Design a protein around this ligand. Structure first.
Ligand SMILES: Cc1cc2nc3c(=O)[nH]c(=O)nc-3n(C[C@H](O)[C@H](O)[C@H](O)COP(=O)(O)OP(=O)(O)OC[C@H]3O[C@@H](n4cnc5c(N)ncnc54)[C@H](O)[C@@H]3O)c2cc1C
Ligand SMILES: Cc1cc2nc3c(=O)[nH]c(=O)nc-3n(C[C@H](O)[C@H](O)[C@H](O)COP(=O)(O)OP(=O)(O)OC[C@H]3O[C@@H](n4cnc5c(N)ncnc54)[C@H](O)[C@@H]3O)c2cc1C
Ligand SMILES: Nc1ccn([C@H]2C[C@H](O)[C@@H](COP(=O)(O)O)O2)c(=O)n1
Ligand SMILES: Nc1ccn([C@H]2C[C@H](O)[C@@H](COP(=O)(O)O)O2)c(=O)n1
Lengths: 234, 234
């Protein structure tokens, strides 16, 4: 029976449990926009100890932590010079290029950083000043991104939907809602970025960290990555 | 031990199980923006049979289905004449009034309907024409709503974050992500609206319905409603 709720002590244990479940007990085996994948709809993953966002198993190597840290610095700095930030990574070129279509502006991008930066002042104020607020939600995916749907663009239509932060009894709790998660590869990056971001937020607020929840409307592993996943299970 | 994952056959069974768990095994007992409540962070609720969105127990009566249907017609019609639509319900007046602050425009509102209406053409096209798309996400809560955070407005800062639809093997699956859920009262309305909306979407696409997932970053019951909840449990 497909297990959709996964609670783990640390990010790596969650990572491995999620990938094992998608490989072994998929809800769907489906031909997607970018190839065949095993998929579980609406997975919920809980990580008890979010400081563990850098996974230790060197076999989980498709996202190097050099790349993850460069991505983090690029994202938290809120800039748009992705060509410079990622010049050492030619394979990401199709995700950082200028919009081809005249429909949306040439300054249009779907980088998370500028959106986080735009919302940080209002969201930090709420998080710091309104006790026990439920209102602190970073919007990543935007309805204005829907202009990408019927286009030939290669820009990311944001896989991350929103990140909610809330503080109870001195601890920061985090809920990252993913529209779409490549659980074998990109989730290593997403776990790193979300781990860094929540510690950034917790430090800004002067609070300690509670736990981390990761919901994924589509949690998938592409068939082309099954061997890679098997390489780090066991 | 606090149960955060609840799977139920129908909306009412989920409703009762969620409320029982918040009352009996809260994660937090917290003083919120609008009073003390029991709370469970990041609850996931699965409803197997989403046609059941009208609950049958007449003791669950704080959201009348006359009101719920009027709300539905108002929302799906995409209009902004809330004063007319809800004239028979004086108690909702503070949620439908014009913005008081000069900061945001006087046409500003947080009604779901116009936002659903704005996104329906692009999202239906994706849902109908891109096979096995993961991209169909109705954004409800918007970052532009953050202008409400440091204001004295009584308008709803959207409790509903997003609603994701996807189709696999002839069936529509729905994932409603709630930022904030009053599980005893308003969740009856939210279940009704989301049940109606997903059947609207499924009919537009000519597909049958799969199941419904409801995630809630804050799932709470106000202490002032504990007696009401106890009245419909058992
Ligand atoms: C701003 C930004 C947005 C991004 N958005 C997304 C996104 O939405 N989705 C996403 O998936 N990634 C996205 N990325 C990229 C992501 O961060 C990772 O770089 C990527 O997921 C790595 O996947 P991969 O290991 O398959 O690398 P890839 O670059 O896809 O593959 C590794 C390289 O090795 C080659 N290769 C290795 N073995 C073989 C073989 N046997 N046969 C043929 N070729 C082989 C491949 O051809 C390829 O060039 C984004 C990056 C940036 C900077
Ligand atoms: C566009 C829109 C947006 C909305 N947004 C929200 C929202 O964000 N959050 C939300 O909670 N609701 C919201 N609502 C309202 C919601 O849809 C329901 O109407 C509401 O949640 C009903 O809650 P209630 O049963 O506590 O009713 P209430 O109106 O809160 O209470 C019932 C009435 O009975 C009175 N009453 C009954 N018994 C007693 C007693 N013993 N002592 C004193 N007074 C008593 C109360 O004073 C009150 O007037 C919205 C409505 C609309 C139309
Ligand atoms: N931060 C991100 C951005 C994207 N993706 C993945 C999910 C899909 O594998 C693909 C996006 O394709 P789609 O838009 O069809 O869901 O990239 C991811 O896992 N994490
Ligand atoms: N569709 C909606 C809109 C709002 N609320 C509830 C959640 C909170 O009880 C309150 C919103 O307050 P807050 O913004 O502080 O979360 O209304 C809800 O349950 N469903």
């Amino acid at each position: 029976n497909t297990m959709k709720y996964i609670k783990a002590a640390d990010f790596q244990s969650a990572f491995k449990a999620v990938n094992r479940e998608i490989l072994e007990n998929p809800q769907f085996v489906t031909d997607s926009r970018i190839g065949r994948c095993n998929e579980i709809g609406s997975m919920t993953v809980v990580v008890d100890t979010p400081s563990s966002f850098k996974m230790t198993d060197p076999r989980i190597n498709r996202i190097s932590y050099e790349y993850a840290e460069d991505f983090w610095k690029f994202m938290i700095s809120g800039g748009t010079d992705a060509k410079e930030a990622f010049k050492a990574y030619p394979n990401v070129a199709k995700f950082i290029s200028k919009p081809k279509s005249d429909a949306l502006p040439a300054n249009f991008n779907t980088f998370y950083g500028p959106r986080i930066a735009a919302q940080l002042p209002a969201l930090l104020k709420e998080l710091k000043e309104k006790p026990n607020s439920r209102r602190v939600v970073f919007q990543i995916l935007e309805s204005s991104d829907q202009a990408l749907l019927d286009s030939d663009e290669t820009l990311e239509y944001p896989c991350t939907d929103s990140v909610t932060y809330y503080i109870r009894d001195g601890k920061l709790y985090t809920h990252c809602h993913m529209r779409s998660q490549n659980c074998a590869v990109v989730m290593q990056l997403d776990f790193y970025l979300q781990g860094k971001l929540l510690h950034y937020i917790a430090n800004e607020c002067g609070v300690e960290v509670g736990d981390y929840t990761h919901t994924m409307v589509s949690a998938h592993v592409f068939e082309r990555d099954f061997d890679y996943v098997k390489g780090f299970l066991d």
